[PDB]
Each structure stands twice: as C-alpha cells, then as structure tokens.
Amino acid sequence: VSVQPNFQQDKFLGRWFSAGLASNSSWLREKKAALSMAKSVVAPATDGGLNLTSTFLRKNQCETRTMLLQPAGSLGSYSYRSPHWGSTYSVSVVETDYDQYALLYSQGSKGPGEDFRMATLYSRTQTPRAELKEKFTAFCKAQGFTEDTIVFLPQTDKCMT
C-alpha cells in the first residue's frame, strides 16, 4: 500500500468521524457493527506518533478507547501493538486532504494478526458525501476487499463532549 506523500501530521490532528470500514475478519466486523461510532480524536504522542481516541456507544453507554500509534520510520506510517489480542499492525495514512477525508489501511506485521487487513474511512463531517463513499469503495476494491465487506458504520450523535 502507498502512504500519503509529504504527509503533514499537524494537519491530520483533531476530530474525525469513523464513517467507513472494510475488514476481512468476521469477528472484528461483527464487533464493530454492534457499536455506534461517535467521534475520534487524533493527537500527537510523546514518541513522535499519534494517540487515536475513539468514542462510541455500546449498549446505550458511552465508552472510549485510546490507541498509541507509534512512528514506523516514515511519515504517515505507524505501528500498533494490541494489548489484549496480541500481534503488531502496520498502520498507514494512504491518502488524505486533511480537511475532508482520510483513508487508512492496516495489516498485521507480526503474529497471527498478519491475517487481518482493514481499511478505514475517516471524515471531518459525521455524514460523508456520496463522493467520499465512492472513493472509499474504490480504494477497498483495489485492496482486494470483497464488496460485502465494505460497510458504512452506524453513527451516534451522543458522546460528543
């Protein structure tokens, strides 16, 4: 996969909405679908990487998860080690215009997580334009995701502050 050329982390900061998902994991897709996504916040981390804080509704209760995306030696490329589930993942900002959308791609780099691939559509607005959806669908198809696994996640207006 390609990484956004001349990636500028400072312009990537702030509030994003998790609008689209493609995963080759039934278990993961099902887990995500049982939730409603609120907002995500991207902020710099001490290692030169990013903290990605995801807010979502589970069973009518607001919840938050924070993931440390460690720098992977080139701008726009990160590494994530899963504390629960094990394995390490390469995480790439493949394409972004910073103020409308971002396309992320991850795949395992160590452990059985290597089997797991995931594309994510982030949007600066919670309801993305139809053209953004088409951009995401086109990217996912090029990355070998089946059409059935390209979905647009349920959103919630709650948990926003």
3-state per-residue secondary structure call for the chain: CCCCCCCCHHHHCEEEEEEEEEECCHHHHHHHHCCEEEEEEEEECCCCCEEEEEEEEECCEEEEEEEEEEECCCCCEEEEECCCCCCEEEEEEEEECCCCEEEEEEEEEECHHHHCEEEEEEECCCCCCHHHHHHHHHHHHHCCCCHHHEEECCECCCCCC
Which technique? X-ray
- Adjacent-strand bridge partners of 81: 88
Looking at the structure of the chain, the number of domains it has is 1
Secondary structure of residue 42 in the 3-state scheme: strand
- β-pairing, 61-71 vs 14-23, is unpaired
Domain that holds residue 130: 1-161
**Block residue for tokens 């679908």:** 33
The resolution, in Å, is: 1.4
The Cα 117–Cα 150 span in angstroms is 12
CATH number for 134? 2.40.128.20
The Cα 31–Cα 23 span in angstroms is 11
Amino acid at 103: L
Asked whether the beta carbons of 21 and 32 are under 8 A apart, the reply is: yes
Asked whether the beta carbons of 43 and 54 are under 8 A apart, the reply is: no
**Closest C-alpha to 79, from 90, 94, 87:** 90
**Closest C-alpha to 154, from 37, 45, 68, 73:** 37
State both tokens at 144.
Answer: 């070998």
Amino acid at 51: N
The Cα 15–Cα 32 span in angstroms is 19
